[PDB]
Write an enzyme that holds these catalytic residues in place. Structure first.
Site: not given
Lengths: 493, 226
Positions: A449, A188, A417-419, A375, A333
């Site tokens: 994110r 990133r 968030s699932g990307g 999670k 998770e």
């Protein structure tokens, strides 16, 4: 005969002469007798075990919180020899529950060293200090283990590990996921125009923590890294000493990389089993109460099958068998990467198969379900799917898939968030809480994110953009804090 | 053991200390209570002389040391409750680094209902500008471990343990102890093995007292076999 009313009063209260205390109190003797040691008659009436003598001194004007030369209140001696009917009377006239002597030990610690059973439950009802320390740094958990108690070394820990969860998944707070290791933060920080150094990774984490004071009731848990805890801030205070000072819980990343299997088709596991008993005894003293156990799951043609489910069913249960014996709250998770192409009828089918084996092994390895967190990932279709769905159809199958496997004993259930996009992840979260279904557990946000996407593009990589990067984090903290309660209306976003 | 049944309840403790170092005669007379069921020590040392030359934190592990809390599986490895109510002669010889040395002799025994013990503290060859005599240490005593061995020569227990004290500069002081407990009577005396205990002492002051004193609050709790 009538001389020295204070000396003769302590003699009748020590042996147990019930026919002599009433005569002295009916003439004109002092109820708060202070001799050479300053020991009030209330101590001798509760240490030996005489409930009848205590009921007479309290109806005249005796100090229940009378401290002697050693600072020992009568509450300590009332729960020392092993008496239950005496402690229940002193707690009705307003006694000092957080009494501290010369060392600084609350009366709750004395009930675990001796061997009290029903007396411990009485002090935990009015309100006692759970994480009470002293000059030696020993609480009520690191002492009963060396003594040899069965109803105290396993029952008392069920309340300490569960009380912390109420201040994390509370209706209004959230979980800030930020455990970017060296093999994940460099990606990133490459296309933006910066590099990957020690100064960049340290200054980036201080912007999301040390900022405005309007994010304290919205953030309940902060996920960090093992290297982050060994670093300090520019002001002069460590990182864990700032999160807990504003109303948050400090986390730490303990899981490592992934290990591919053999004879599969891309199935991997989670590394972080060896050396677990040696790391939980050190992270607890620093200020870490939880962690983050992230796995890698995908949906393909035949994956997962009858091998990845059975393998991950034991790893998620073995990790929760060591952290609960120290002071770390395990967080499962079961993240499932929405890869390939699938609809709602196929993505929900795989979710019900993986979560069915999670709590199955927890009932065998002695796992306290009322003190753990889960999670799970959302039920979202793949990116290659051509059939679109609304925000109401996604939240309908998400709640139904959780009520079939997740027991109601869980304190709170978070999501990911699932990307997807930053704004899309906040809209679908509000539709879950507005579903007309009775949810016994609590819901909140725990993105990794979307909670820091706006604080990265507008940050750049200089020093004058500190006030401009922290402004976008306030709008994201208040938006996700309202979607978990049912009062979130998308205006201009 | 037959002597362990006499320690049920509250037993008064009488402290009678009388030492003499460098020609300075001093006497310490204290009193209090004790408890052997749960391991609780409550004493109040009162200095009858006044200005005590020797410090206070260095004279903590002296008398008592008999109301310890032993587990249910360690009742057969007791020695302090085996020579009761006959008693035992507790002789010690505390050493130091580069200073002096102590020499005590305790007689822990009962005279009817109150524990009376007399200690004749001796020892010469000291300094006038070190940790002893000169007031240089603080007023605090942390936790320490006491290792108990065994002996089959002169019929006794040779207790050996090393503790440490604090100061106000940054150094570390190490001391050596060689406790030799010898019983008085010829009755049933047990022979313990090798085990260590704990010590949770606490020192404070008292505004209602003008003379020198030492409010000691020690919590002794046994552990297991080393």
């Amino acid at each position: 005969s009538g001389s020295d009313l204070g000396k003769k009063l302590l003699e009748a209260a020590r042996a147990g002469q019930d026919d002599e205390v009433r005569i002295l109190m009916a003439n004109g003797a002092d109820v708060n007798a202070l001799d050479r040691f300053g020991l009030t008659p209330l101590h001798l009436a509760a240490q030996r075990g005489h409930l009848e003598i205590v009921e007479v001194l309290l109806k005249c004007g005796a100090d229940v919180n009378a401290a002697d030369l050693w600072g020992q209140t009568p509450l300590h001696l009332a729960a020392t020899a092993g008496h239950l009917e005496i402690v229940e009377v002193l707690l009705k006239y307003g006694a000092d529950v957080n009494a501290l002597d010369l060392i600084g030990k609350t009366p709750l610690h004395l009930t675990a060293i001796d061997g009290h059973l029903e007396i411990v439950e009485v002090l935990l009802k009015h309100g006692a200090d759970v994480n009470a320390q002293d000059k030696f740094g020993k609480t009520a958990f690191d002492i009963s283990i060396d003594n040899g108690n069965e109803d105290l070394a396993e029952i008392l820990q069920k309340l300490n590990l569960s009380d912390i969860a109420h201040r994390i998944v509370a209706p209004g707070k959230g979980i800030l996921a930020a455990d970017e290791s060296t093999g994940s933060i460099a990606k990133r920080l490459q296309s933006i125009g910066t590099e990957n150094t020690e100064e960049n990774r340290r200054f980036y984490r201080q912007l999301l923590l040390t900022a405005d004071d309007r994010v304290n009731p919205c953030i309940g848990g902060v996920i960090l890294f093992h290297e982050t805890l060994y670093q300090k801030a520019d002001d002069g205070r460590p990182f864990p000493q700032v999160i807990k000072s504003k109303g948050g819980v400090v986390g730490i990343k303990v899981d490592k990389g992934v290990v591919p299997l053999a004879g599969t088709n891309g199935e991997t596991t989670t590394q972080g089993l060896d050396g677990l008993s040696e790391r939980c005894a050190q992270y607890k003293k620093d200020g870490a109460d939880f962690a983050k156990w992230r796995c890698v799951l995908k949906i393909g043609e035949h994956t997962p099958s009858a091998l990845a489910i059975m393998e991950n069913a034991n790893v998620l249960a073995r990790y929760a068998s060591i952290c609960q014996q120290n002071g770390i709250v395990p967080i499962v998770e079961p993240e499932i990467l929405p890869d390939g192409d699938h609809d709602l009828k196929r993505c929900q089918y795989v979710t019900e198969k993986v979560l069915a084996a999670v709590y199955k092994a927890l009932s065998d390895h002695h796992i306290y379900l009322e003190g753990t967190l889960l999670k799970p990932n959302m039920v979202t279709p793949g990116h290659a799917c051509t059939q679109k769905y609304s925000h109401e159809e996604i939240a309908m199958a998400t709640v139904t898939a959780l009520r079939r496997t997740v027991p109601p004993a869980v304190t709170g259930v978070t999501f990911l968030s699932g990307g997807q996009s930053e704004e899309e992840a906040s809209i679908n979260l509000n539709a879950i809480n507005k579903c007309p279904l009775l949810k016994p557990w609590a819901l909140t946000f725990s993105y990794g994110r979307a909670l820091q996407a706006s604080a990265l593009k507008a940050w750049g990589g200089k020093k004058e953009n500190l006030k401009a990067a922290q402004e976008e984090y306030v709008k994201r903290a208040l938006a996700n804090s309202l979607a978990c309660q049912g009062k979130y209306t998308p205006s201009g976003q | 053991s037959k002597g362990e049944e006499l320690f049920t309840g509250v037993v008064p403790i009488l402290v009678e200390l009388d030492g003499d170092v460098n020609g300075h005669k001093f006497s310490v007379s204290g009193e209090g209570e004790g408890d052997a069921t749960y391991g609780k020590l409550t004493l109040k040392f009162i200095c009858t002389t006044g200005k005590l030359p020797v410090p206070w934190p260095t004279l903590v592990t002296t008398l008592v040391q008999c109301f310890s809390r032993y587990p249910d599986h360690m009742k057969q490895h007791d020695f302090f409750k085996s020579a009761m109510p006959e008693g035992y002669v507790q002789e010690r010889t505390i050493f130091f680094k580069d200073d002096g040395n102590y020499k005590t002799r305790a007689e822990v025994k009962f005279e009817g209902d109150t524990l009376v013990n007399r200690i004749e503290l001796k020892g010469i060859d000291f300094k006038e500008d070190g940790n002893i005599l000169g007031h240089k240490l603080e007023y605090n005593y942390n936790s320490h471990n006491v290792y108990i061995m065994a002996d089959k020569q002169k019929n006794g227990i040779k207790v050996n343990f090393k503790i440490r004290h604090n100061i106000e500069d940054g150094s570390v002081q190490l001391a050596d102890h060689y406790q030799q407990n010898t019983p008085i009577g010829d009755g049933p005396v047990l022979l313990p093995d090798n085990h260590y205990l704990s010590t949770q002492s606490a020192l404070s002051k008292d505004p209602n007292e003008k003379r020198d004193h030492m409010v000691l609050l020690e919590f002794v709790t046994a552990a297991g076999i080393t």
